[PDB]
Amino acid sequence: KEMPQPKTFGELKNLPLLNTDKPVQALMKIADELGEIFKFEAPGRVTRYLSSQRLIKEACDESRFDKNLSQALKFVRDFAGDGLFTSWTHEKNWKKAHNILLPSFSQQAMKGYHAMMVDIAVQLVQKWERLNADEHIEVPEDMTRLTLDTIGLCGFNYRFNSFYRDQPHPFITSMVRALDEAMNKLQRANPDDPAYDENKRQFQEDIKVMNDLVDKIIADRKASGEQSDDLLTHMLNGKDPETGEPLDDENIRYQIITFLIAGHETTSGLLSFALYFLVKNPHVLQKAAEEAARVLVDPVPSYKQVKQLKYVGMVLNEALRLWPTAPAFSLYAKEDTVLGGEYPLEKGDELMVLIPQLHRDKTIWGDDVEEFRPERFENPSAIPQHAFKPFGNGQRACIGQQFALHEATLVLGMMLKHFDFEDHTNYELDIKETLTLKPEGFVVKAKSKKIPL
């Protein structure tokens, strides 16, 4: 059927529609206008945006469709390489890293990371306990400090000490500016102009800073022989059961950059969006706070206590439904095929899955899709297959899902235990798009319940 397509700009086709601060939000508004699928053309490129569970459940069939690197992921690949996130399924290093790393990221493995996660979580709570009266909290800034430090410590036993600085660690400055450069290049009608020559030189310098710090950490761990329980050790020792080969030090670097991108961007957004929805739904906040206080009886939460924070877990899943912080993923057709019995696709045709739109499909969620009701996640088996995908699909799904939800549950748990929150500015949601989504300018006041650590 003659697929809907948004408005065009002559020779540039649809491309200048992405010439905005908020491209994901612009494409969500196009999906509201045009429905479950639309064509998006750019000079030398065609993509098809999917919004309905009906079509996305077919796209998630691994026999017909495989992960595609979007233009965003091709640009991140200049510094994240053949790390798990920016590698094609058919590259030897994808399956090799997947087999080696999977056990390191299982629910079982989280008992190992727990103590380290607590270390950074206690630093967050102590910062907030130490604020004077009528001082406020910058939420996404503090959550980003936390998530970044938690992966640094759990990933390679490195302390970024974000809670001791206004000015972020040099490596972080280079990563943030590389990601900015990577997302900026999407929109540019004339890639290799002379304004961009200056950006190019900055980008190559930012790639070098990340490479140098990570290569030094790998070299220093090799020389020490210390067997810390972190991902770096697992990666230096570990053999793929398939090939019987370990990762070489170049790929280990790419994995570690990959992890620090994920810490920085995704998990901090989840925690920021959850706190936002809690202050805007006080009945739901009171339910989550009642659970935190009943379950988290010890000054230091244990692994087991975090596992019994069911309603905090439902809050995090409901925040991920409304604002999935990594809001899209891309597929290509392995062979000629028909999508939904009505859209023919040629081998190599791209689909973009718009996760925020999948998560608003009224045929799945009912007619109150815009309300924050964690009760939707009361019973996991009641959610239809491929209706809820904040962590992507099949073998190319987020390897960090258990790590993210453990950290977010522990931290949100401790935040609701230790503080009452005031939306003192009546914050209006403003969603900044980098690689990910974050509520920009989200500020609150925390009143300590004066419970000891």
Ligand X SMILES: CC(C)Cc1ccc([C@H](C)C(=O)N[C@@H](Cc2ccccc2)C(=O)O)cc1
Under 8 Å between Cβ of 133 and 151: no
* 19 contributes a contact to ligand X by CB under 6 A: no
- Which residues on adjacent β-strands are paired with residue 86? none
For 206, the token pair is 């930012």
Q: What's phi and psi for 332, nearest 5 deg?
A: -125, 150
Residue 254 labeled ligand binder: no
Write down the least CB distance from residue 157 to ligand X, Å.
27
* 104 contributes a contact to ligand HEM by CB under 6 A: no
Pairing of strands 437-439, 431-433: antiparallel
Write down the least CB distance from residue 194 to ligand HEM, Å.
33
For 377, the token pair is 């996640």
Q: How far is it, in rounded angstroms, from Cα 240 to Cα 244?
A: 5
* 329 contributes a contact to ligand HEM by CB under 6 A: yes
Q: Is 374 left (phi over 0), alpha (psi -120 to 50) or beta?
A: alpha
String of contacts with ligand HEM for each residue 129-168, x by CB under 6 A: ----------------------x-----------------
Annotated active-site residue 60? The verdict is no
Q: Residue 267 gets which letter from DSSP?
A: I
Q: Binding residue for ligand HEM (CB under 6 A) from 40, 158, 203, 259?
A: 259
* 42 contributes a contact to ligand X by CB under 6 A: yes
Pairing of strands 350-354, 45-50: parallel
Q: What's phi and psi for 39, nearest 5 deg?
A: -75, 140
Q: How far is it, in rounded angstroms, from Cα 291 to Cα 306?
A: 11
327 binds, among ligand X, ligand HEM, none (CB under 5 to 8 A by kind): ligand X
Write down the least CB distance from residue 134 to ligand HEM, Å.
32
* 71 contributes a contact to ligand X by CB under 6 A: yes
10 Å CB burial of residue 373 (0-12, 13-18, 19+) is middle
Write down the least CB distance from residue 239 to ligand X, Å.
30
Q: Which is nearer to ligand HEM, 306 or 326 (CB)?
A: 326
Q: Which is nearer to ligand X, 291 or 349 (CB)?
A: 349
For residue 252, give the H/E element and its range: helix 249-262
Q: Which stretch binds ligand X (CB under 6 A): 168-176, 220-228, 278-286, 325-333?
A: 325-333
Please work out, in degrees rounded to the nearest 5, the angle formed at the alpha carbon of residue 161 by the alpha carbons of 412 and 285.
10
Q: Binding residue for ligand HEM (CB under 6 A) from 30, 76, 84, 415?
A: 84
213 binds, among ligand X, ligand HEM, none (CB under 5 to 8 A by kind): none
* 435 contributes a contact to ligand X by CB under 6 A: yes
Annotated active-site residue 398? The verdict is yes
- Selecting among 65, 156, 329, 391, the annotated active-site residue is 391
* 3-state SS string for 165-198: CCCCCHHHHHHHHHHHHHHHCCCCCCCCCCHHHH
10 Å Cβ neighbour count for 338?
Answer: 11
At position 346, the amino acid (one-letter code) is E
* 70 contributes a contact to ligand X by CB under 6 A: yes
Residue 398 labeled ligand binder: yes
* 326 contributes a contact to ligand X by CB under 6 A: yes
String of contacts with ligand X for each residue 388-427, x by CB under 6 A: ----------------------------------------
Q: Residue 374 gets which letter from DSSP?
A: G
Q: Which is nearer to ligand HEM, 392 or 439 (CB)?
A: 392
* 27 contributes a contact to ligand X by CB under 6 A: yes
* 24 contributes a contact to ligand X by CB under 6 A: yes
Q: How far is it, in rounded angstroms, from Cα 182 to Cα 74?
A: 9
Q: Given the rule CB under 6 A, which residues bind ligand X?
A: 15, 18, 23-24, 27, 40, 42, 45, 47, 70-72, 186, 326-328, 352, 435
Binding residues: 49, 398
Active site residues: 266, 391, 398
